[PDB]
Write a protein that binds this ligand. Structure first.
Ligand SMILES: [Zn+2]
Ligand SMILES: [Zn+2]
Ligand SMILES: [Zn+2]
Ligand SMILES: [Zn+2]
Ligand SMILES: [Zn+2]
Ligand SMILES: [Zn+2]
Lengths: 252, 252
C-alpha cells in the first residue's frame, strides 16, 4: 500500500501501546545506548521495535535512533524516530512526535510526522505540497515586529542580541516536531548550532517543511544538505523566509 | 458542591466551548483591553463568562484577568485565569490551562489548574497535599547536573551565565501552567524578572507548589507576597529548592 497509509498505521500502533505510559517517568529505565551515543530508554525501544514489525517485511532500507542502520541494499530507505523528544514524553510534557521519513535514492519522497496528543498528521510528498490532516500548509508571512522563534545555540551566540531582535521565545524539546511548527506557520524559525540534532530527528520534517516554504539552511548559509545515518550530529536553520535566516546568520 | 467540585466543573464547561478554537487563528477577534493592559481575545472572554456564570450565583469575590475585580465584600475571593496563555492556545501551541484559586481572608484554601490538552487536573487544598488526578504529585529534589529550568528574564539577567548551569532549557509560554510543572516535578525552576506575570496567572497554582514543596520568592530571595488583583505585574521565582534558588538568585 501507499507509504502514506504505511506510516499512519505504524503511528497509530505506537500511539496505542505507549500513550498510557505518557509522563509515567517511573515505569521507564535505560535499556541500551544508541549508536549516536545517547542512552536508549525502554518506551523508545518498544516503539522502534513496534516499527520494524512493518518495515522489516518490506525489505526496504532502514535507519533509526536506537537501532542504527539495517542495509537491505534497496532503492528505498525508511528513516524512523520512534519518539521525537523522548524526555518530554517520559516527563509528561505534551510535546513529542513520531517521525517517519521515506527516501528514494537518497531523495526525499514522502514524509510523515505525527503529534500524538493533538491527533495531528503532518504529511507531505515531494512535489505535492504539505498537509496538516488534509489542509494545505505553508510558512508564515514574515514580519520583523512579531517574530517568534525557538533555538538551541552554542556558547557563541549573543543571546541578548537575539532576544532583542526576537519578540517571543518558545523553546520546546523536540526539533523534528518543532520544524513542523514552522511548516504550518506558528514560528518564524527554529535552528540548532549546537551540533546535537541528528538525521533521524529532522528527516521526515525536512521534507514536509520544504514543501511548505521552509528554508532548511546549514550552519553557514547554504541549503542544509545531509546524510542518512543513525550517527552524525549536525547544524541546521529551518527558517520561514530569507530575512529570518539572515538574523540567525548575524547572530550566528 | 465542595470548591474543587466547582473548579473541576467550570473547566469541563470551558473545555467543550474553546477546544474548537485551538489554533483556529481565523476564528477570533479582540473584544477589549484587560486591566493589566493585555488584550482580551474572544476565546478569552467567552471562557471568562463561563466562570462568572457559576460564581455569580454565589456571593463571593471574583478576580479574573479580562474582567478585573468584581467585589462583593465576602471573605471568599475567587481568582481565575480563563485561559492561561491565550497566545499558545490560539496559535496551536499545546500549552495552556485553566486557573481556579480560592483564598479565605486573603489566605490560600483551594487551588486548581486545568490543562486541557493533557487532561491533567492540578489541585491542592491548604495543608492537605497536592495531587494530579488523584496520584499525589510532589516537587523534585536538587540535582547539580540535571537542572531543567524555564525562564522569562530581564536584560540585566546574565544569560550565558544562566545557560552554563541549567542542563535543560524549556520555555512553554504559560508561567501559570508551568508552575504546576514544578508541581509534578518536571522543572527544577521557573522565573519572570520582567514583571509581566500577575496575580491571576499564578494564584491558583501558587497554592499548589506551596502545598507540594516548592519555594516561592520575589527577586530578592524573599518569600513572595502578592495581592489579589487584575493589574499589578510582579516578579516571581518558583523553585525546586534553595541550592537552585541560590543559583537563580545570583545570576540576576
Ligand atoms: Zn534519543
Ligand atoms: Zn527520539
Ligand atoms: Zn528525535
Ligand atoms: Zn491574557
Ligand atoms: Zn489568560
Ligand atoms: Zn494567564
Amino acid at each position: 500500500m501507499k507509504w502514506d497509509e504505511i506510516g499512519k498505521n505504524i503511528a497509530k500502533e505506537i500511539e496505542k501501546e505507549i500513550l498510557p505510559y505518557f509522563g509515567r517517568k517511573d515505569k521507564s529505565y535505560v535499556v541500551g545506548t544508541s549508536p549516536s551515543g545517547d542512552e536508549t530508554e525502554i518506551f523508545d525501544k518498544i516503539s522502534e521495535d513496534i516499527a520494524l514489525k512493518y518495515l522489516k517485511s518490506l525489505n526496504v532500507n532502514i535507519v533509526s535512533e536506537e537501532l542504527g542502520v539495517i542495509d537491505n541494499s534497496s532503492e528505498w530507505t525508511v528513516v524512523i524516530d520512534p519518539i521525537d523528544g523522548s524526555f518530554n514524553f517520559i516527563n509528561g510534557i505534551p510535546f513529542f512526535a513520531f517521525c517517519f521519513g521515506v527516501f528514494k535514492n537518497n531523495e526525499p519522497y514522502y514524509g510523515l510526522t505525527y503529534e500524538f496528543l493533538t491527533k495531528s498528521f503532518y504529511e507531505a510528498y515531494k512535489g505535492k505540497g504539505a498537509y496538516l490532516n488534509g489542509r494545505k500548509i505553508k510558512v508564515k508571512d514574515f514580519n520583523p515586529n512579531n517574530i517568534v522563534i525557538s533555538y538551541y545555540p552554542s556558547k557563541k551566540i549573543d543571546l541578548e542580541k537575539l532576544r532583542n531582535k526576537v519578540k517571543r521565545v518558545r523553546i520546546f524539546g523536540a526539533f523534528g516536531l518543532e520544524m513542523c511548527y514552522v511548516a504550518k506557520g506558528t514560528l518564524d524559525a527554529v535552528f540548532d548550532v549546537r551540533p546535537k540534532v541528528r538525521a533521524v530527528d529532522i528527516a521526515s520534517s525536512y521534507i514536509i517543511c520544504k514543501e511548505a516554504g521552509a528554508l532548511i539552511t546549514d550552519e553557514n548559509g547554504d541549503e542544509l544538505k545531509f546524510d542518512l545515518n543513525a550517527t552524525d550530529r549536525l547544524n541546521i536553520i529551518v527558517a520561514n523566509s530569507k530575512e529570518m535566516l539572515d538574523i540567525i546568520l548575524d547572530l550566528l
